[PDB]
């Protein structure tokens, strides 16, 4: 707030890939849908993905969007990306939620 503005909201179950056990796991520990924002830090022209579980408001994801990021729209409702530290997945609750977020993500990547 003050420093950033949200540029989208989308309904998704946020998951992270467990490389060691070759499975997706729920981000933050609990399975459930979250409200996932992309937030724009207006001053630096930087963007960050932040999500909070609907039920308890726990932040399950808070990861910058780096320049050049490769965003994989594997399916119409499941998109994923990586960093040096994690692989992230968004299991969106509809195709509308996916295109809203995907659309927001692509704009940010074009603007970085």
């Amino acid at each position: 707030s003050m420093s950033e503005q949200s540029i989208c909201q989308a309904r998704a179950a946020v998951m992270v890939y467990d490389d060691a056990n070759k499975k997706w796991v729920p981000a933050g520990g609990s399975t459930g849908f979250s409200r996932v924002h992309i937030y724009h830090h207006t001053g630096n022209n930087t963007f960050r993905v932040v999500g909070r579980k609907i039920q308890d408001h726990q932040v399950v994801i808070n990861c910058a969007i780096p320049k050049g990021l490769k965003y994989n729209q594997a399916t119409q409702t499941f998109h994923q990306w990586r960093d040096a530290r994690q692989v992230y997945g968004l299991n969106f609750g509809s195709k509308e939620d996916a295109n809203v977020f995907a659309s927001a993500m692509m704009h940010a990547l074009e603007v970085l």
């Binding site: 998951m15 890939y17 070759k22 997706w24 994989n72 594997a74 399916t75 499941f78 994923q80 990586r82 692989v87 997945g89 299991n91």
Partner: peptide, 6 residues
């Protein structure tokens, strides 16, 4: 990019 969850 690992395959989706299910």
């Amino acid at each position: 990019x690992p395959p989706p969850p299910x």
